[PDB]
């Protein structure tokens, strides 16, 4: 349940530490992004020497939320903290080369095979 102004920890090694959601993409008046949803972000905190820079505007895919995901059986998977993986604006592809922390099955689709393959643990 990521919305505009929601700060996300970053789950890759792109060099961003804290990003902010500035748009929930994919719909007029769309309110929230869950996991597997692309958002537009501004990088609010970056490591000094990283592939991305503070104040950069780009995309991210939400991979962990505190709401979490429901599963078809009715079960839910909540995470501590909201995290996203940075993506290129045009290619939609991840910018880092490492994924840190678990991701979910909801992220498993043609578009995010890289994040699934790189993740330590897919839930």
């Amino acid at each position: 349940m990521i919305q505009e102004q929601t700060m996300l920890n970053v789950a890759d090694n792109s060099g961003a530490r804290r990003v902010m959601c500035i748009k929930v993409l994919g719909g007029s008046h769309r309110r929230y992004a869950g996991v597997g949803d692309i958002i537009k972000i501004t990088i609010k905190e970056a490591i000094p020497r990283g592939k991305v820079k503070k104040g950069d505007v780009l995309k991210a895919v939400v991979v962990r939320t505190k709401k979490g995901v429901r599963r078809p059986d009715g079960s839910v998977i909540r995470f501590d903290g909201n995290a996203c993986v940075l993506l290129n604006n045009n290619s939609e592809q991840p910018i880092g080369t490492r994924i840190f922390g678990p991701v979910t099955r909801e992220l498993r689709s043609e578009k995010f095979m890289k994040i699934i393959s790189l993740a330590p643990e897919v839930l």
Binding site: G68, D73, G101
Partner: protein, 114 residues
């Protein structure tokens, strides 16, 4: 109600082990990767149990790869293949939500030998 009792009972899993909040449990869940079912183990502390017959649930909390992860399992869902208690913890409280604030040393709980 009696009708719904029957429908829910006809469906309730029969092998659910005894476990209490604070117990470290390992839950085997079925993962359907494409076509094939494997078992994925989720091992963590039971921080909450909902006792509702067929709608019984329990929350398991563990730190995966640096981040706390809670899975609320539906006890009788057939996706939960098995539950096994690995460590009986000693908490005197039904819901261990205070563990969400605990880190490391203060998040572990006394082993229950009772």
């Amino acid at each position: 109600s009696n009708i719904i009792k029957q429908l829910e009972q006809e469906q309730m899993k029969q092998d659910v082990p005894s476990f209490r909040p604070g117990d470290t449990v390992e839950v085997k869940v079925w993962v359907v990767e494409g076509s094939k079912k494997r078992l994925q183990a989720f091992e963590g502390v039971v921080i909450a149990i909902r006792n509702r017959g067929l709608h019984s649930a329990f929350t398991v909390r563990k730190i995966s790869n640096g981040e706390g992860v809670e899975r609320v399992f539906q006890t009788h869902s057939p996706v939960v293949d098995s539950i096994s208690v690995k460590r009986r913890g000693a908490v005197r409280k039904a819901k261990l939500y205070y563990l969400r604030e605990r880190t490391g040393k203060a998040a572990r709980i006394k082993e229950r030998l009772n």
